[PDB]
């Protein structure tokens, strides 16, 4: 768990060197993008349940997975699916605020593949659900904030696949 | 073992549906990236031993693991380490050509953690070796071919960790 | 597919992909556009293919629809047209993939054991795919009909 600042400090410390001009430029880049990160995080905190339910309405609804036999069939499985998608959106917001995806592979992508493979959860359908969540939130917060959200959404989909 | 084409066909077949426009778009994406995949595979087949020896020269040489007591100490262990790194580079090339990491968890990441844990092989040092191999081959084939190599290198490092 | 077959064939041999296999993958990558056009041609007109091929099949082989045959009755004829729809779908998959490993690896391995356990004459199924091939290659241009008839040819060859 480290943001862009802590990773820059960790690189300069593992070097043992002081903060040179490249580290200063990286921190200036983060300190310019931080206000946009803050406003996108507020806008995403506004519409958590709406983004999640629009992602299910785009991908998972009216398909086979909500029908009998699907892994999203029962009300318990539906509630756990909404819980999993809320987790993905919340941690993508955290990784957007930090500017570093270390929290994603520390706390989402750690044992997620083995959990989903033990439960029988389809990984492709949940990857499509995360992609639709990314599409909806990029329609919500704009072009560049949607892109800096979608880089961590693509990180979650890549670590899941 | 399936490429992007076989996974798209398997999704459309498990649906039982015909190939709709999203599958056509996915296959068009693969058929646009395939020539770059071919040229990067030729360039990686050019310099297998050079990429492997530069990865050892970056990470594992002159550290404790090549000294007495390390797991890379003897000539047998050195030869087996070069063999393991050649395996990682070869299968990352295969997964780059297929465009799907199914061969990696089918044929590399299957019993690799338990093998390395039974032998006493350090997993962090070999993860750093694979990361340096990724850095060297991304310096070799360019930005975007290096990225589409590094996604499968990160897949191998994530499944190993 | 082609990429799977080349990767596996280099994989057993403990070598990388040879450059001839690489220009094979490159030529398949370039011909994928025509493959997708043949796939849209086969996908969009599946109703007329299945209908006309079932009509010509039951005209050609009337004993399987006569009382005593397998596909006698309403639901049995519907299941017969469903099996023909399955095989046209696998034809579309094999057209896109550039090789017959979707068709063989899904619906051609134990086809004799399955259709022997159902009580089905397999020659009449070969005639069904023959009529499907006639309607489908009557629907396209010349090289498109040849490229689709290669996979139709593989299905009828794998029947008998």
């Amino acid at each position: 768990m480290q943001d862009a600042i802590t990773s820059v400090i960790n690189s300069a410390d593992v070097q043992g060197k002081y903060l040179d001009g490249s580290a200063m430029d990286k921190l200036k880049a983060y300190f310019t993008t931080g206000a946009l990160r803050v406003r996108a995080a507020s806008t995403i905190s506004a519409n958590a349940a709406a983004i999640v339910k629009e992602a299910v309405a785009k991908s998972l609804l009216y398909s086979d997975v909500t029908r009998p036999g699907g892994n999203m069939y029962t009300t318990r499985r539906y509630a756990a699916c909404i819980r999993d998608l809320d987790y993905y959106l919340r941690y993508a917001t955290y990784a957007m605020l930090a500017g570093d995806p270390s929290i994603l592979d520390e706390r989402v992508l750690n044992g997620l593949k083995e959990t989903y493979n033990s439960l029988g959860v389809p990984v492709g359908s949940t990857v499509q659900a995360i992609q639709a969540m990314k599409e909806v939130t990029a329609g919500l917060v704009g072009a560049d904030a949607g892109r800096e959200m979608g880089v961590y959404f693509d990180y979650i989909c890549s670590g899941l696949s | 073992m399936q490429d992007a084409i076989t996974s798209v066909i398997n999704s459309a077949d498990v649906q039982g549906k015909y190939l709709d426009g999203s599958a056509m778009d996915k296959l068009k994406a693969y058929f646009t990236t395939g020539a770059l995949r071919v040229r990067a595979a030729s360039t990686i087949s050019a310099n297998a031993a050079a990429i492997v020896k530069e990865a050892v020269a970056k990470s594992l040489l002159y550290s404790d693991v090549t000294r007495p007591g390390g797991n890379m100490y003897t000539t047998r262990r050195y030869a087996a380490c070069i063999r393991d790194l050649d395996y990682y580079l070869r299968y990352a090339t295969y997964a780059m050509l297929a465009g799907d990491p199914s061969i990696l968890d089918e044929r590399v990441l299957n019993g690799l953690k338990e093998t390395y844990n039974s032998l006493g092989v350090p997993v962090g040092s070999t993860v750093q070796a694979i990361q340096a191999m990724k850095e060297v081959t991304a310096g070799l084939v360019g930005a975007d071919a290096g990225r589409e190599m590094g996604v499968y290198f990160d897949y191998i490092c994530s499944g190993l960790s | 597919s082609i990429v799977t077959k080349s990767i596996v064939n280099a994989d057993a041999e403990a070598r990388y992909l040879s450059p001839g296999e690489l220009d094979r993958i490159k030529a398949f990558v370039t011909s994928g556009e025509s493959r997708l056009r043949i796939a849209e041609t086969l996908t969009g007109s599946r109703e007329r293919i299945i209908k006309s091929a079932g009509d010509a099949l039951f005209q050609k082989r009337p004993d399987v629809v006569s009382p005593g045959g397998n596909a006698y009755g309403e639901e049995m004829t519907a299941t017969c047209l469903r099996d023909m729809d399955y095989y046209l779908r696998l034809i579309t998959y094999g057209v896109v993939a550039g090789d017959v490993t979707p068709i063989e690896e899904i619906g051609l391995v134990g086809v004799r054991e399955m259709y022997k356990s159902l009580g089905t004459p397999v020659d009449a199924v070969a005639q069904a795919v023959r009529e499907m091939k006639a309607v489908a290659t009557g629907m396209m241009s010349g090289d498109d009909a040849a490229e689709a008839g290669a996979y139709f040819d593989y299905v009828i060859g794998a029947m008998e």
Binding site: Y62, D64, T66, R67, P68, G70, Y73 | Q15, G16, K17, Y18 | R46, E47, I50, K51, G54, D55, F58, E74, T77, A78, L81, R82, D85, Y86
Partner: peptide
């Protein structure tokens, strides 16, 4: 031949197309 619809188009037990005839046969007041 003419009763045959593609097996993707056929409604299944999760689909609401089975109850659609009841949804259009029932009257809803304005």
């Amino acid at each position: 031949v003419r009763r045959f619809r593609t097996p993707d188009r056929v409604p299944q037990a999760g689909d609401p197309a089975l109850f659609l005839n009841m949804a259009r046969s029932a009257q809803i007041p304005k």
